């Protein structure tokens, strides 16, 4: 009851700001998740015993693929957060509770391929849930661990706190899927714009959630740049190893997964920062303005991409 998580001095500053970067040690990284909780949440919103035992079956049940990794999952609740601490009084106890562990779980036993693959492989996965395919499994598998002996940390809420939580886990994972980012977000901005935007209105509050949600996972491009370059070098390792499988398929990849198109990769980085990460950060700043920094930090990446094409680095 009593027992806090406290963090060096150098942590337990940046950990506040939204471009920390949670390090290289491994063992601290589930202590930083529940320093998080502790600090978003209360010391009393889970039993110690039973969140310890959920974040490392959750641990278990991530791959060791070059991005949609553990480090990944700790990164993503870490922006959600941050974002979480400067809007405060926006967000009902049971919405600090379901979107933390919702980030947490929000890639569970991700193989490193998207769900394009799956379908042209013919994954079984596939023929089960015809859409957002790899999101439809990485809810599955957190309601199998929170339903293991000893692992539901949600005990103590009543059966409807229960069921709206589980609801909440459950849109938030589904909108980690970007293919429905682009919609979401052309509906937030003519909301937003034309006046209507009303966070009582929960399929609104549904829809902001939902942008959270892609913002905290798109995070990597909102880092200081060494980090920034570095998690890109992981991206590209796995988008190049689908490309290969592709080739083994018979079809040509997409240029951003053919490992013989490098060469483009500066080019193709300006192109998302253009088509997804600005207006992802722009139309999250409008919402919800405490979250500037994202946005700021992500047109400062930009602006380093353009430097690399000029051969300025
Ligand atoms: C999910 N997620 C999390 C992060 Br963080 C970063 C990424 C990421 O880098 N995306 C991209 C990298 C790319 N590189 C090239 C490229 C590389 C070489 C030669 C020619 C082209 N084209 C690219 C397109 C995208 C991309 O998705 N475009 C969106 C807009 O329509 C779908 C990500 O997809
Ligand atoms: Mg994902
Ligand atoms: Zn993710």
């Known amino acids: 009851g009593l027992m806090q998580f406290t963090l060096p001095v150098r942590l337990c500053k940046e950990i506040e700001l939204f471009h920390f970067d949670i390090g290289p040690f491994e063992n601290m990284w589930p202590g930083i998740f529940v320093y998080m909780v502790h600090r978003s949440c209360g010391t009393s919103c889970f039993e110690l015993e039973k969140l310890c035992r959920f974040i490392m079956s959750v641990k278990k049940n991530y791959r060791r693929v070059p991005y ?65 395919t790899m999101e439809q499994h990485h809810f599955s598998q957190t309601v199998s661990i929170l339903q293991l002996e000893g692992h539901n940390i949600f005990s103590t809420l009543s059966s409807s706190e229960y069921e ?6 459950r849109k938030a994972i589904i909108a980690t899927d970007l293919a429905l980012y682009f919609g979401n977000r052309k509906q937030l901005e003519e909301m937003y714009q034309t006046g209507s935007l009303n966070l009582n209105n929960q399929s609104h509050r549904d ?107």
Not at 74 to 98: P, S, W
Not at 239 to 247: C, L, N, P, Q, S
Request: net charge negative; charged share 20%.
């Open 68 to 132: 949609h990794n553990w480090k990944h999952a700790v990164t993503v609740a870490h922006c959600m957060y941050a974002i979480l601490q400067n809007n405060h009084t926006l967000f009902t106890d049971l919405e600090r509770k379901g979107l933390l562990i919702a980030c947490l779980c929000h890639d569970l036993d991700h193989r490193g391929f998207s769900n394009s693959y799956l379908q042209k492989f013919d994954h079984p996965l596939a023929a089960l849930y015809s859409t957002s």
């Open 207 to 313: 829809r902001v959630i939902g942008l959270m949600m892609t913002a905290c996972d798109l995070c990597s491009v909102t880092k200081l740049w060494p980090v920034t370059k570095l998690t890109a070098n992981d991206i590209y390792a796995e988008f190049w190893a689908e490309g290969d499988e592709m080739k083994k398929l018979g079809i040509q990849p997409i240029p951003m997964m053919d490992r013989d198109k490098k060469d483009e990769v500066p080019q193709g980085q300006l192109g998302f920062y253009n088509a997804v990460a600005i207006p992802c950060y722009t139309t999250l700043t409008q919402i919800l303005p405490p979250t500037e920094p994202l946005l700021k930090a992500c047109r400062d990446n930009l602006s380093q991409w353009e430097k690399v094409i000029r051969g300025e680095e």
């Open 164 to 169: 709206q939580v589980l609801e909440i886990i």
